[PDB]
Write a protein that binds this ligand. Structure first.
Ligand code: CNC
Length: 106
């Protein structure tokens, strides 16, 4: 007989490395991971991605039908131009953040 409460936050998910680009505000509970944001964007319709289960956890391999090729990867960043220091299953965005998926070659 007591109330609990959680914070709903909004994370902007953006992909500028594709034609057409993707940019959508995604609502999730605070504590959701980037992977949960991608799952919600896919549920909403209009976002697709793939992952593979590496020995380090979920590794993002494809975004909106573009799989990273040889010596390419999908880099995770927050605005402004700040690479994330954790992967999709561990980074927990904050309200108002913009998460960018960027195709990068090394
Ligand atoms: C080189 C490297 C490294 N990476 Co990268 C970096 N920078 N990485 C990369 C590259 C690998 C290219 C290749 N060689 O094929 C690159 C450059 C592709 C990369 C990718 C990423 N990396 C990333 C991160 C954060 C990390 N990476 C390390 C694992 C991190 C390593 C830091 C370290 N010294 O441990 C690292 C420096 C080298 C590991 C290695 O050479 N041996 C690993 C190998 C011997 O064993 P393994 O288990 O088979 O390794 C594979 C996986 O680790 C995978 N991998 C690499 N990074 C990640 C990150 C995640 C989350 C996962 C699930 C797998 C990987 O690639 C390895 C080769 O196949 C990391 C521990 C370095 C760090 N101190 O932050 C860190 C993981 C932190 C965590 N979650 O615990 C990115 C999330 C960065 C970003 N903001 O985009 C990104 C993954 C996003 C995605 N698409 O899912």
């Amino acid at each position: 007989d007591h109330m609990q409460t959680q914070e709903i936050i909004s994370v902007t998910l953006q992909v500028l490395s594709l034609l057409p680009p993707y940019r959508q505000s995604i609502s999730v509970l605070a504590g959701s991971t980037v992977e949960d944001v991608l799952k919600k964007a896919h549920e909403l319709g209009g976002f697709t991605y793939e992952t593979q289960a590496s020995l380090s956890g979920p590794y993002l391999t494809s975004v909106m039908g573009k799989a990273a090729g040889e010596r390419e990867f999908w880099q995770l960043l927050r605005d402004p131009n700040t690479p994330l220091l954790q992967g999709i299953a561990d980074y927990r965005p904050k309200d108002g953040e913009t998460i960018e998926l960027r195709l990068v070659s090394w």
